[PDB]
């Protein structure tokens, strides 16, 4: 351990922005956390994001509205933000700076893990092959879960992505026909969504297996980017130290992205897109990336990284480089939702990149992935139809064509619609999707082999 | 296809300016030959 | 022998009193022994570029100057064995450590010096004899299917003083001994070459045999070569990841190099879980793949600086390689993650960007990577030929091909594998576009078609015209509504659809889609284009007469025929040898021709 | 802007070691 | 002479990209030239760009690799690097910075030149006139080239204008009623291309006139910057010294901006347009303006650079500046090349601003002039109306309109599509625009007076 | 009596050729001649302009012209008109000058088209479609404009 004393120093050399510079530092060292006091006795920290010589960089999580520049004290804490995790977190409440916000006590930890974490070594790694019934036949059907895979939910602000994730968390279980610890990040979102949140795990009579983290709206910016890597490290105690398996949600990723481009704005760093840091994505994927199983321990971490898509853009820069990192996506839109559809998934511009391992024979039932690949097919053509005859007209059409637009209204209302509280298993789902297709004549069905069609399609 | 995929420019934000103006008036004086013809359609139908 | 760290500003660490020091010499930054590589020099004060996370770093910690710059280490035991992005084994680290993280400051040798390997030397040296650069003189046994030949390193050269007899030899002893001017040199089983410098060839000769993919799309309009160089710049889901997949499982290369710069971790568990479960026949024996295969992960998460080296570390594995007589396809699963490290290590730096953020010198660094690839004469006494095939991603922001690096890029490979993510939207995979690829090495295998096809390629062409027609003819039908379409449009249009939906898409993740032999791929476009021809002669020849053979005729007629061609991929080549299947499609052929007959 | 910023930057920056 | 001890200087201040920075050196020349000497004896060469004080910047050229603070010897030539140059330099194939490649001797010094160019005096240029015969229609026939004239080829990346180059070079010659040498400067240039041209050269018979500089795409990057001034100083000595026609092609002056680019960053210049150096005008006017024909002298230089355009535009900067240097372009098109049509010129954006005078009675044909005008503005409505069938549809076109879709689909399959191994002769290409012309009725041919259509038009 | 300058002259020659030009144009308009000046290209002096700034490091404008490039216009093009001469012989002279602004294209958001379009007073702007149709001289006849109906009206 560290038995030295830190040492306290006066030298704030300026503040520029929401960077405080320090001189006159002895052996600064990088990304060591600094502890300072305003002169009204209020308390803040920052890290040190440079050093040079006897300068160094640090960056206030708090702020720096009413930093002085002779009565500042800061003290080096000589280590780096590491964390105190235990077991018995779940069923706190914890702010986005680590700290109870439930009048319980303070973390006693079991030990001290670096909020950067470390890469798994890939060679150890073991490659996910369990699915999770989400019993949402738009997902467990066309875009399953596995155990351990990164799916964030692409929204776009006014859509019951919350609502989605909440039941998720609750009807969350396995085809092999169990408990999640979940940790749920709430980060740039306001009052009434994350008390939604935690009423919800406490209806649901979870909450002893539930740990929060909240940075509302109202709380500092700074924050926000270590609230996930908090939720995380505690995820990877649970995980990989106690073979607990754990689901995780960051809400609203974009308020992470934003809390980011105002700190790469006030570094001045080199652009992207739309003002993001030109390595957003490495960033992005130290947080995605603490997620799946790793061999010989019996844990896990499954991830679902919701955020909102500014101007329901798919190719802004944060749904962009999620798609990149991420396993996929489910994806919800406001066609769906401005007709009353729950939960408004549109499976069309969605994917599950472990879906082709998690399903078939041993896993759920054989036809699993000739259902999905067909009801893909049937899906867009009817919605390509419509695009044809929003111009050409009913009478344009013929019987081939009338037969994908019969097949798109069932589909959207005998499959995707569902309701908050309809849990469906898989195999209910595949068989919903055979009454679908059977809409169709066998000659029609041109992603199913005949050796699958002779026995699921006569029934 | 989603695009008419011109490179993005001043002189292509000035192009496309035109060319949507074109295209609305277009569907104006279109939209009204078929009121026209749409009246006497039911003009003649009448009859 | 050390300098002084004076501030990291991340991947970046500036450190003092290195005055003797070089550019791209490799140094120990910290006392952990962090790997990094100078970048700059500014009078006694170097900028280091530093391979691995720098968090802890503190002013003043030592940094020990190496002579040595970044280099590979060359030798037996990289075949089966994933490396780091600065080739340190991760088997050999987790069956060290113990622990399921990689630690960093880790100094683990690339080749283990504990194996005893079988040498068998050439039998045609002497003492006395004069041998050059590229010369073997042995053979290492590392498993059944590649025979690792020990070369004389490059910039080395003599008379031979000693060779070792056959027998049991690790890495750590000496198998050759030469002497040049009274300086005498004692060699390994492994060399040592600097990654940043192009492994020297006798002439590199042009690309004249393919690169054999398992699809149908990839392969039939749009070939790759042995040598050549390819780019993927896919969006997000659009399968790019599962061609360059299929690619490596099924080829007719000899050595597979796969580098996992900046990709998911995931997909490198998913290739260590499923390639041993691979076969491929070798002489009436069935062996497995890894055998024949090696793979970097420098996966997203880790650090970025370690991208540069991971992309060099490959391509420096796969010359490796050529040099013995092997035909490489190395493929680099990103491209676009190397160029991002570029341009945030630019930005440390403060230099100055060209477009879109990224440094002036990006084309400089592509360029100067993918003309390493290609078909060459070896260096050596023994006349080996080889190649190195490049089979590179980009990740395109937005899809929009735009950027410096698909820009740069294309301008640099020879072929073209476009992506359409509306594609993927339906599922269609392979998404290739088909409208915005190209090859540039159609004319260099037209004498291979002819040698040994001739049918294929009037074939291509036939096929090209009737894509290229649909897509000139969608564009106004999607405006008239397929009201002034001519018979012979219509046709057009849905053959064009039964080539689309049946020859161009695969599902890779079948028994029968996971391998697509050549043969069948023109075997059944063959068939399709024959009834193009039969159905369009059908209308031509009577759309002048008593009664026309139009659309609807043919295809309530001949039903049977359209839904038999469609199946025509349901053949599981593994379960159904080659003759049931050229059987079956000439038995759909003679169905054709038979309901021709009764129809016109 | 962002190359504008900078090299107004390494003006000042150039200025200031002159001084 | 010049008979003066040179200094060599350990005295290296710094060494960032490709720039090498030295101090203490003694009275520093602008432009002068320095040898490098690695610690392991490799030797290279740069140039200095700038000199303050006691400061000097090298410009190296093979690059800095390897390069130290401390024993890197730098001896400073005294001079500008004027280059050796000789009249038995064709037959011969040299490196990016005109060192033998071929295994022959260094290149004797007949003479020296200073390849930074000497301004030709205005007054005694003598304009251009006689037409080269190129044998590609649309070269020959509408955007015509006079000896003397400055015409580069505008492509994008793989579009066959590597094939149009070739073509040219071994067709090329003049509108009879004796050949030229060849200047080769191969920038960045990948090793297909540079055994495509290198073996065409020798197949036909040309490398007794061929002097080939050759910098490839795996060479070093700043060494091309001299390499094009290196062919056209050579040119310069054949064509106004030694009285020869020399046809200089440069095949790629983006791959030349791009190491200006990289050097303008290297020094932190103030940029202009996507990030290119704001003097890229002036530094390919000097390179563009060597040409042309000179009192007194009967050779001349002719050329024909190469630019591959980024993105598929003609409003990037570097063909942007180029365009207003040159006298015209070629402008090879993707559109015609996706449809199997060679050479793949569009002739709507492409001019040749010398060919209203190097044509008609006396030269060419008197009609040349009237053909080409009337089949430009023919090809141009084609292309007018084709754009509206794309919208109306063919249903919906008149008969004149027809008439010019006719003449389109003809115009590019006849006049336009010729092959890489067949030559037509001016007068060969205009009767097949006749025969494109004879499609209309002579009431529609307004660009061709009544007297030219009387004679030609009803043969 | 022209001046010649090439694109491959020092950008400080090319920025002074149109100073020299317009000198000697005032110099004849003192003597009472009527003097017409011809411009082939006020675009290539704004390049100078352009390329002069970046190479003095100051802070540049709209794509990377001067902020002050709309002042050196309007000096070059307000040097001119129907004056009365200085000297005893009451003589009256004038300067017509014809400006040339090669166009990148016929978005007159071009920063030397837009500053010319502020000062000058007639504008023959050249249509690029009619152009392309052959019909020469090619004048849009619709954008173009001449301040001086009123002035010719007598
Ligand atoms: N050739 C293919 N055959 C079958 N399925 C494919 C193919 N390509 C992609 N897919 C499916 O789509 C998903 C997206 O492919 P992936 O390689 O992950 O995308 P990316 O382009 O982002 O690398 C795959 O995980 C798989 O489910």
């Given at each position: 351990?560290?038995?030295?004393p ?5 030298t704030?050399?300026?503040?520029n ?15 060591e ?9 209020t308390?803040?920290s ?5 050093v ?7 960056q206030?999580?708090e702020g720096?509205?009413?930093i002085?520049a002779?009565?500042?004290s800061?003290?080096?804490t000589?280590?780096?933000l590491?964390?105190?995790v235990?077991?018995?977190?779940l069923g ?17 930890a ?8 470390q ?11 369990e699915?999770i019934?989400?019993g ?5 059907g ?8 990164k ?6 602000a006014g ?7 909440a039941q998720?968390?609750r ?5 092999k ?6 940790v ?13 949140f ?7 009579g979870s ?9 509302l709206?109202?709380?500092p910016?700074?924050?926000?980017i ?16 106690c073979?607990?398996?754990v ?9 992470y992205?934003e ?5 790469s ?8 897109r739309r ?9 992005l ?6 997620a799946?199983?790793v061999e010989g ?10 955020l909102?898509?500014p ?16 396993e ?9 939702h401005?007709r ?8 069309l511009p969605?994917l ?8 078939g ?11 999905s690949?067909?009801?893909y097919?049937?899906y ?6 419509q ?17 994908y637009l ?10 995707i ?26 000659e029609m ?7 699958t ?7 | ?15 496309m ?25 039911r ?5 | 022998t050390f ?20 550019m791209y ?22 900028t ?9 770093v503190?002013?003043?910690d030592?940094?020990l ?9 060359l ?18 680290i987790?069956?060290?450590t113990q ?11 690339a080749?283990?010096?504990d194996?005893?390997?079988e040498?068998?030397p050439?039998?045609?040296?002497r ?9 073997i ?6 498993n059944?299917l ?11 050269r ?5 060779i ?29 070459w ?6 020297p ?5 042009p ?16 070939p790759?070569?042995?040598?050549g ?5 896919g ?17 007719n290369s000899?050595?597979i190099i796969?580098?996992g ?12 879980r499923?390639?041993?479960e ?5 002489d ?25 080296a991971?992309?060099?570390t490959g391509?420096?594995?796969?010359e490796?390689?050529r ?5 490489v ?10 160029a991002?490290?570029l ?5 440390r730096?403060?230099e100055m ?7 002036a ?7 100067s990577?993918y ?12 006349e ?7 089979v590179?991603?980009v990740?395109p ?9 698909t820009?740069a890029?294309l ?13 993927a939207?339906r ?11 190209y ?10 078609y002819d040698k040994?096809?001739?049918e294929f390629?009037?074939?291509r ?17 999607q405006?008239?509504?397929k009201?002034s ?6 046709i ?10 049946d020859?161009?898409?695969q599902?890779?993740?079948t028994?029968?889609?996971r391998?697509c ?6 075997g ?7 009834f193009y021809?039969?159905?369009?002669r ?11 053979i ?7 007629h ?7 061609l ?5 053949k599981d080549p593994v379960?159904?040898?080659?003759a049931?299947?050229?059987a079956d499609?000439?038995?759909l052929?003679?169905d ?9 | ?9 390494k ?9």
């Open positions: 351990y560290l038995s030295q830190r040492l306290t120093y006066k704030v050399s300026g503040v922005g929401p960077l405080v510079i320090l001189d006159h530092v002895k052996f600064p060292r990088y990304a956390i600094v502890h300072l006091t305003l002169p009204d006795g308390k803040r920052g890290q040190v994001l440079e040079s010589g006897s300068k160094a960089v640090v206030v999580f720096t509205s009413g002085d002779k009565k500042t800061c003290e080096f000589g280590d780096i590491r964390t105190p235990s077991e018995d977190m706190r409440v914890f702010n986005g700076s680590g700290k109870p916000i439930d009048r319980g006590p303070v973390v006693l079991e030990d001290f893990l670096d909020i950067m974490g890469p798994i070594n890939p060679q150890c790694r073991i490659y996910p092959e699915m019934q989400t949402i036949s738009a997902i467990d066309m875009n399953s879960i596995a155990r351990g895979q799916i964030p939910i692409f929204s776009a859509l019951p992505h919350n609502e989605i994730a998720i968390c009807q969350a279980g396995l085809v026909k169990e408990n999640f610890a979940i749920f990040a709430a980060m740039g979102v306001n009052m009434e969504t994350a008390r939604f935690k009423s919800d795990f406490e209806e649901n909450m002893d297996n539930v740990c929060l983290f909240l940075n709206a109202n709380d910016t700074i924050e926000r270590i609230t996930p890597r908090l939720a995380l490290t505690t995820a990877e105690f649970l995980a990989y130290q073979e607990k398996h689901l995780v949600i960051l809400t609203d990723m974009s308020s992205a809390a980011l481009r105002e700190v704005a006030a570094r001045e760093e080199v652009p992207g003002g993001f840091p030109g390595y957003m994505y490495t960033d994927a130290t947080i995605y990336e603490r799946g199983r321990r019996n844990g896990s971490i499954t991830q679902i990284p919701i909102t898509m101007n329901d853009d798919i190719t802004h820069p944060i749904p962009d480089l999620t798609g990149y990192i991420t996929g996506q489910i994806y919800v839109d406001r066609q769906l401005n009353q559809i729950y939960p408004p998934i549109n499976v969605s599950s990149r472990l879906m082709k391992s998690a399903i024979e041993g896993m759920t039932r054989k036809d699993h992935a000739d259902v690949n067909q009801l097919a049937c867009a053509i009817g919605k390509d139809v695009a044809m005859k929003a111009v050409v007209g009913e009478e344009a059409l013929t019987s081939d064509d009338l037969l019969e097949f798109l209204q069932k589909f959207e209302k005998n499959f619609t569902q309701g908050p509280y309809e849990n469906r298993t898989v195999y209910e789902t595949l068989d919903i999707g055979w009454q679908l297709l059977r809409i169709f004549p066998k069905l041109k992603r199913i082999p005949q050796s069609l002779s026995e699921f399609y006569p029934r | 296809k989603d695009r008419i995929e011109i490179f993005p420019s001043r002189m292509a934000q000035t192009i300016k035109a060319r949507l103006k074109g295209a609305q008036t277009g569907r104006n004086l279109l939209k009204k030959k078929s009121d026209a013809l749409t009246l006497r359609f003009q003649i139908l009448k009859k | 300098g002084y760290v004076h501030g990291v500003s991340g991947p970046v660490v500036t450190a003092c009193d290195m005055a003797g020091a070089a010499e490799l140094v120990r930054v910290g006392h952990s022994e962090l790997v990094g590589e100078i970048i700059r020099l500014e009078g006694d004060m170097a280091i570029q530093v391979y691995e996370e720098t968090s802890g503190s002013v003043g030592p940094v100057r190496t002579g040595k710059p970044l280099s590979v280490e030798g037996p035991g990289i075949m089966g064995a994933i490396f780091d992005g600065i080739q340190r084994p991760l088997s050999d987790s069956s060290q622990s399921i993280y990689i630690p960093r400051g880790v100094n683990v040798s080749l283990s010096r194996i005893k390997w040498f068998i050439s039998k045609n040296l003492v006395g004899s004069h041998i050059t650069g590229g010369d003189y042995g053979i290492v046994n590392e059944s590649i025979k690792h030949k020990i070369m004389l390193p490059p910039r080395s003599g008379s031979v003083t000693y070792a007899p056959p027998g049991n030899y690790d890495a750590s002893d000496v198998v050759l001994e030469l002497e040049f001017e009274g300086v005498k040199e004692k060699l390994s089983m492994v060399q040592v600097p990654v940043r410098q192009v492994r060839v006798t002439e590199k000769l690309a004249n045999h393919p690169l054999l993919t398992g699809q149908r799309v990839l392969d039939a309009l749009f790759c070569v042995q040598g160089t390819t780019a993927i710049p969006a997000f889901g659009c399968g790019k990841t599962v061609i360059s997949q299929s690619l490596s499982k099924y080829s000899d050595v796969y580098v710069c900046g990709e998911r971790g995931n997909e490198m568990s998913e290739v260590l499923d390639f041993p691979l076969t491929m026949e070798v009436g024996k069935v062996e497995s793949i890894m055998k024949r295969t090696a793979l970097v992960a420098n996966t997203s998460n880790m650090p970025v600086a370690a991208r540069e991971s992309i060099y391509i420096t594995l796969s490796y390689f040099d013995m007589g092997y035909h396809s190395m493929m680099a699963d990103s491209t676009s993650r190397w991002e490290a341009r945030e290590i630019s930005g730096l403060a960007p060209a477009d879109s953020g990224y440094p010198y990006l084309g400089a660094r592509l360029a990577f003309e390493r690839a290609g078909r060459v004469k070896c260096l050596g006494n023994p080996r030929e080889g190649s190195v095939s490049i590179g991603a990740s922001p937005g899809g929009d091909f735009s950027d410096p690096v820009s890029t301008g640099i490979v020879q072929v073209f594998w476009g992506l359409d993510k509306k594609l939207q599922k269609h995979f392979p998404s290739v576009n088909w409208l915005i690829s090859s540039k090495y159609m004319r260099a295998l037209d004498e291979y040994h096809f001739t390629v009037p074939l062409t036939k096929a090209k015209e009737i894509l290229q027609e649909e897509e000139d003819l969608a564009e106004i039908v405006l008239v509504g009201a379409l001519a018979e012979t449009d219509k057009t249009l849905e053959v064009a659809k039964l080539i689309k939906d020859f161009l898409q599902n890779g993740y028994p029968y889609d391998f032999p050549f043969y069948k791929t023109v059944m476009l063959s068939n399709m284009i024959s021809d039969m159905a369009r059908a209308v031509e020849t009577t759309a002048q007469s008593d009664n026309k139009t659309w609807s005729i043919i295809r309530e001949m039903g049977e025929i359209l839904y038999k469609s199946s025509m991929k349901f379960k159904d040898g080659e049931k299947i050229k499609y000439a038995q052929l003679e054709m021709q038979n309901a021709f007959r009764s129809l016109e | 802007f962002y190359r504008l910023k900078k090299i107004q930057e003006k000042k920056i150039i200025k200031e070691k002159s001084e």
